[PDB]
Structure 1
Amino acid sequence: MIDVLLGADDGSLAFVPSEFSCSPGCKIVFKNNAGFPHNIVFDEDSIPSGVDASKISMSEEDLLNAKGETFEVALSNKGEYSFYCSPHQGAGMVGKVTVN
């Protein structure tokens, strides 16, 4: 599995890592680190065809509010999955996972 920090240790509004690669069955655990609240959203138009975004994404309205809170994702279909934090998207808090 891949552990991803929500917020850099220094408080920067970033996923760490932000771009990473894995294979079918890939599991990702996003953990609130700094600069929260944060969330993790995948838009349907920015993930592979035939993937249900609602099954991998937080709702834009929901947030992880405290250090250490987690949101887990498991991926199957190959392709590129772009994601972002909704409150911090405009600050560049975005990422992409590639399943090859």
Structure 2
Amino acid sequence: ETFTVKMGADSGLLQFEPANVTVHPGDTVKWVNNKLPPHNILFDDKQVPGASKELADKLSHSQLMFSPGESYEITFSSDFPAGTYTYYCAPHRGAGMVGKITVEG
């Protein structure tokens, strides 16, 4: 499957819609730049299963996205461990623009 997460709610709020998402092995999470750019997706080394920095760096879209429609996908294949993945938006961190992905396995 493919779960779409909008960066910036329609209401004009600095949030990820949905904030919490539960994914199964093989599913894809698609982030779409919606409202109030820029945004980026950052995963901290200790916010991913096993505290793997190597894993966090691969998932983290450090670069800022400005134009609406720009997307970033992550297919959680058999390779990725099971557990919760917490991420955030650096420019809107103070606004509490935080997200969470739970991979069940």
- The alignment's TM-score, normalised by the length of structure 2, stands at 0.87
State whether residues 40 and 83 of structure 1, in contact with CA within 8 Å, keep that contact through their aligned partners in structure 2.
yes
Instruction: Pick the structure with more strand per residue.
Output: 2
Task: Report the aligned-residue RMSD.
Answer: 1.2
- 1:26 and 1:89 map into 2 onto residues whose CA distance is 27
What is the aligned partner in structure 2 of residue 13 from structure 1? 14
In the alignment of these two chains, the number of paired residues is 98
- Structure 2 gaps of 5+ residues are none
What is the aligned partner in structure 2 of residue 58 from structure 1? 61
Q: How far has the Cα of 1:26 moved from its partner? A: 2.6
- The alignment's TM-score, normalised by the length of structure 1, stands at 0.91
- Structure 1 gaps of 5+ residues are none
> Letter of the aligned partner of 2:81 in structure 1?
N
- 2:99 and 2:27 map into 1 onto residues whose CA distance is 16
Deviating above 3 A after TM superposition, structure 1's stretches of 4 or more consecutive aligned residues are none
- 2:15 and 2:55 map into 1 onto residues whose CA distance is 25
